[PDB]
UniProtKB/TrEMBL annotation, chain B:
<comment type="similarity">
    <text>Belongs to the TRAFAC class myosin-kinesin ATPase superfamily. Kinesin family.</text>
</comment>
<protein>
    <recommendedName>
        <fullName>Kinesin-like protein</fullName>
    </recommendedName>
</protein>
From TrEMBL, chain C:
<comment type="similarity">
    <text>Belongs to the TRAFAC class myosin-kinesin ATPase superfamily. Kinesin family.</text>
</comment>
<protein>
    <recommendedName>
        <fullName>Kinesin-like protein</fullName>
    </recommendedName>
</protein>
UniProtKB/TrEMBL annotation, chain E:
<protein>
    <recommendedName>
        <fullName>Kinesin-like protein</fullName>
    </recommendedName>
</protein>
<comment type="similarity">
    <text>Belongs to the TRAFAC class myosin-kinesin ATPase superfamily. Kinesin family.</text>
</comment>
From TrEMBL, chain H:
<comment type="similarity">
    <text>Belongs to the TRAFAC class myosin-kinesin ATPase superfamily. Kinesin family.</text>
</comment>
<protein>
    <recommendedName>
        <fullName>Kinesin-like protein</fullName>
    </recommendedName>
</protein>
Length: 212, 226, 217, 228, 219, 222, 217, 214
């Protein structure tokens, strides 16, 4: 009598141990947060840069290096992003310790728990459904906190959005004075910072700080 | 007791299974919350871009020469006025978006009110322990989290699509591409500053006047239907 | 004269190289992930040999004993875990990164731009290529260096997970003491099952993550 | 183009000096294997030390009672084992500064990168069209070569350790003895017999770590790997 | 009657004579001034060098112009510490060694007490006053030592500023790295000026320096 | 016969004043602290001066980095510290000159006492001469005590305050970093740690530490 | 936007730096607590002794055991009056002594202010806020003085009851006149007046104030 | 633009707070009682300890078969009484809320909400507001302790005549200095005790406090 209660207790405390294992994962979870947000930032970069390419008239006459260099930096920043997005995907899908914990190790625990007394096929059903729920909720967590992260570091990375900045500058330069060349220069610069690692490093720094 | 634990178990499971089928039946409000989360992202970007433009305004001083300001001075002051409005607009919008997304739905009724109700009717069953009710609370929480997840997944993909479909309303990148192209032409030098102030005003009012919102709602519903 | 031309081209060569080195230095998150991979790999290989040697001592099983069966089972699981973890650790170690992209593609672009200068000869070009190769090799150096030291420190931090030496110490200490022979036997069985399951259940993997992450900063 | 061939061939001499040093580095195998072995051996002994410390740390003696009924020699065996643990910790504490000293001894690798390289630089500094920028490239390439050597050292010593730790499996007395113990216990009535076997085998394996057989086996296996 | 007046006068005359004998004995003071100020100087030298030293990490056998310089600087630190660790007890000893002033205020004065105790009208009260007057003359001498060593040290910390190489080289290093070309050589150059610094404190240039500045303060 | 009475009355009054001087601890400990702290601040001053002497001067030039930010912030902290010390030293002197009850016990109260004692039988001007001599020596011996226990205090504090001696600690940290693993990481480490050392000298942590340590040394003797 | 919030945060953090500086200045705090308490004590003491003296009855050319019973005490009163008249202004010189604290709140505060006046978006209104908060901290350190010095005084008047010879002696006189004898008054008096003149009262006070400086914190 | 917005929002915080200052100045010229209460409290506890210690000299030496003051000892404990009554009275009198306590609680915290309603007005101005109000509170408290102290230091001289006990020990040693007639002691001191009980003291104290603050 009251063996039902004891078996239930075993199931519950097993599942809770798995939950605590899950909560201890931090480094790969954060690396994945960071991958999702960075991917969003890089798709907006590739779209902004494709828009400013499009506005270039292929001159075909039919009877300055300051901008050719700008358009050049544009094209190879597209090339950078195009290399980088598959690598972020790849990195994202690499298996982690948590995976093993939730698959093989959790199945091993199941088998042992089934050899107890009073453990039915229903207890197994409940155990399996809980582990499937935990597996899914890992993705829940990734999607949630990477959205929150992206929202925060779109504020923090403002300094790198050089087009809004150069336009605000340039219409301030009407009423507070050469301006064409100033814009070409600040644009070249903001490009370079996007290509030369200054951006990938800024993002590493910010998200890291967030994790501490 | 042989059939007792088996069938208390079966009642718990069938309760939960019906609730799951109910969740599938209320796949209706989901489209509105998808659209909200996507739209909130599009606006957070717009607000930040605009704020950045406004943040360059250096004031006008005795030390500001302000030479070469013809009729462009009033263009520029309307640009700052528009920008200020667009911020005040996005600032009013965003909490209405929160208020909408947060509002109670059919799904919430399935998973909250009615879930606890069914719980109480289940407590008054033979051989129902508090462990059974913990398992009920757990599976319902997971169904909440499964719905949350569908929200975040679909809305992220929606956004990925919208940033393509709304190519046209991103006036700032296009106008910069055009300004430098227009120094690259021989003829377009004089027209350049004017054209920039004008198409910028255009872009700001397209975001302000309802056009961008409406195209957003179109492309979104189009994506959802297919 | 042409002397100042030579100094101009030498200063440009140097400053492009120095820009490249500053860029390598900032690539810090991946360099740590790799340090930690190496330290973890050594820790785990030693766990595997320790566990395999406890297994080599087992009688061939009866074909065609209760707690000791549990313990042997755990040993086999832990070996499966480690044989799962190791190929993955190699994969993550070889996973390319932005450092690779600086060291190959951005460098070749800067060389195209540089090799179109005032007095830039193909010898300046050869030195530029070599210096790039040397930074790429020095990254590897630092991995081996910093991973060596990190492991030296982790072995001490992680001392409480080394359940084998501690449980043999404990066992002889309480056969020597007035404590009985069964209390000794049962205490060893218990403490071995525990050391094993903390090796198995993430507790060691979490401790290692925690300590190594604390070392950075 | 008198100064063209000047600049071109003062670059050429630089390349050829550097490449000569590189070739002299490549033929330095036997003398590297000494440093390989010292690094591998140091890590092996640091491990041995920690594992023995961890044994010794579980020592908490309780005084016997006037009432104690127990019998046997087991406490004498255990105290001798503790003694041998202290002797091993001593041995290792002694021989680590040795290894440091041996590694610190300068080799003909050191002579090619240090004495000999600085001696070639000075003659290159009396060359026509040579400038301190050339000298900076010289110093830079040499220090890159020192670093390449270091990489060789860390890499090959790590691989050698990984192989040694299997070669030396027989001396790892303490997992092996917890093994033999657990395997005996399943056959009951042999429990006291198994305690005796364990005390005896710990004593032996401690002696084999203490008495220099372990150091011999280590050097022997490292040689066998060097040849292959 | 007229007798305690006589006893009193002889007590006062004896004490005044001791006082005039203390005055001619200015020699010993200067030496002890130098001892006390020099000991304070070497205490601070010790603490600075120990702090520089406390930052050396243990040598990792994997760890690999600078290395040679930093090794030989650390050795110069350890040499300076040993020099001061013996130089200090040497200085205590020199300060303790008996003097003609010590003699004139212990032996000479107690001989005189014995003599004065066989006089007509010499109560023990008289002898208590005598011992207290003598201990007071000792404390005047000690006050003199502490006063003038304090002032002397105050002055020597300026006069000897050029041996305070360590803030000096901090300053040259930050100014150098605050410039374009200096940075290149900065890490070498402090390595040099530090070494020289540690040598001038050890080779004896500073002990001769100190001694000569003290010669001037006393003259 | 009775001259023992007059000598004993003399001795007794002098013991009164001596025990009274003994009970005057608070201002004693504060004057110890003043003399100590003064010396520590004179040393700090010379250090900071010496680092500023190595900064180059300022003229019409091209006006030429992040280092420049760090280095010029340190130079400004230096000028700050020097101003702090040049303010505190005259304060410390004026705090030391301030008179105490001890002054009164050894001047007005004593002269008063001797005038009372010059009204007694057996009392002579030679006893008055001894009274003045003894008072004058206790007057001098106060000073002696100040010199002695300030010397000892300083020799202790120069150890307990070791953590604020940032210049030697950072030059040692620097040379330890270079040649061994970790370039301009060490240069940054120097600038940061120098900045924090100067601020801890400026923010009161050092004055608070001194006021705590010499406190402790007092509580021992209590 | 962010600029406003950040310039506010910089204002607040500077002000709270000053806050934590004043927090650490306990020595001169207690010096001034003590000075104020002691001034009150000595004032009441002076007025008591002057009221004793006001009944001396002017003597001059007049009528030639009790000389030691009245004259010694009238003298000891004249001297305690002397001593108190010496001590009071010394206490006011001591209280007015500048301190590191003044430095914190004046020269240092104005240096930092000047250094904030060339931050981004710093307005003369920020500066007026700053000076207002400085003058506030300056006023509150006063408040701290007044509060603790009153609380102290109330402790000391009880802790120091044994030096209050004059109510005590009127008591011990009227009690022995109800009993079966009087000169005890004159005797114990002289002793009380001496204990207030010889330093016993002063050093008793220094002791209790030390004790409170310690245990209260 | 918003440079002028910032000028104005700081302008409104300034002028609001200065209104509250000018309120405090004039309504402080009214709060004279608190001063007087705290001073009285100190006067009375001084009185209590002095009376206590004269009473503390009760030994009741038992006599044996070998062969007015009480009135006074009574007056003593009567005054210890009057005082132990009067102290909690005075503390309650001190704790009562007045106009200021409202001007810096309610009239301030309400004009707060009003200031929050203003545009451009964030939570940092709300924190500056609250902190300036606490500084005003503490400045009023300063005022309180300050002028109560000075008041006490004057009152000690003003009530010099009621300090009967040093007066009468002085008269006794004066009357023993010139051998005459003890009885004058008991009479004069009884007189002073009744001066401290009948309320000439409390009333002369009030008159001198008011008379000083005029």
């Amino acid at each position: 009598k009251d063996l039902e209660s004891k078996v239930f207790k075993i199931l519950f405390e097993s599942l809770e141990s798995t939950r605590k294992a899950i909560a201890k994962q931090n480094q790969e979870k954060w690396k994945k947060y960071f991958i999702l947000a960075k991917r969003k930032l890089l798709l907006s970069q590739k779209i902004e840069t494709e828009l400013v390419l499009e506005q270039r008239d292929d001159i075909d006459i039919n009877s300055s290096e300051s901008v050719f260099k700008i358009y050049d930096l544009c094209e190879q920043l597209i090339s950078k992003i195009e290399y980088q997005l598959p690598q972020l995907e790849s990195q994202y899908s690499q298996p982690t310790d948590l995976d093993y914990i939730l698959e093989d190790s959790a199945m091993q625990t199941l088998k042992r728990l089934q050899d107890e007394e009073g453990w039915t096929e229903h207890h197994s059903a409940i155990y399996r459904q809980s582990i499937q729920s935990m597996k899914r909720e890992v993705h829940t967590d990734l999607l949630l906190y990477s959205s929150i992260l992206y929202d925060n570091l779109i504020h923090d990375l403002s300094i790198f959005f050089y087009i809004p900045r150069e336009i605000g500058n340039f219409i301030n330069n009407i009423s507070n004075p050469e301006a064409n060349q100033e814009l070409l220069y600040n644009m070249t610069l903001g490009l370079e910072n996007l290509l030369n690692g200054e951006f990938d490093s800024a993002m590493e720094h910010y998200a890291m700080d967030y994790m501490k």
